[PDB]
Amino acid sequence: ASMTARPLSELVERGWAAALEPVADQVAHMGQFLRAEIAAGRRYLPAGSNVLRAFTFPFDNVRVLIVGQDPYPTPGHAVGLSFSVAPDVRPWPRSLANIFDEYTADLGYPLPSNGDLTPWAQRGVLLLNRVLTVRPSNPASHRGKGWEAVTECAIRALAARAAPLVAILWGRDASTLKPMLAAGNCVAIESPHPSPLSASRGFFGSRPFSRANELLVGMGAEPIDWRLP
């Protein structure tokens, strides 16, 4: 079942499997790393079957990617889509509450009913983290353990498609993908991360949702429907 045991052709959507072929061995290696963590009595989030969830929506349909740092550190929050929580989760994580405050300020929409960002993933938004696992209660605990080559490969593969792309890069780890978006079909929006620690330094007022749609329209691409129920 794990990414140690089974090939990309089974774990992810067909387009993503071909896109991530250069990091096939690296993905299996990450499988081995998580096995070794369980063997040692350390835990990881999200659940193994959710780790590559962002690549289970069609590669060919991605128009925008949102890139965070790493998954939520609290058990019951991370679901393998960056910033998303399961429909029954309340309260929202403070990062997500901050995203929803900018979402209302930018778009004029009411607060969403819940924290499930599945609609965005279904409408061509890739919900990526630079690093795809974390040890509970220890943010950035799996930084530099091999995920960066996988998320680099994903961005590089998206950018090489003969299709417009807009990247929303939230925080310092996300912004290390900026050099791979240099090509003329690609444009990056960068801001500080919506985490309480950083959000007051430029996240609030950044209007990422409306600016991504302006950037798409200007490249001849259809805008994202951001409206959550």
Ligand SMILES: O=C(O)c1c[nH]c(=O)[nH]c1=O
């Ligand atoms: O608060 C955070 O750092 C994050 C929390 N959850 C994510 O999915 N990505 C992040 O970057």
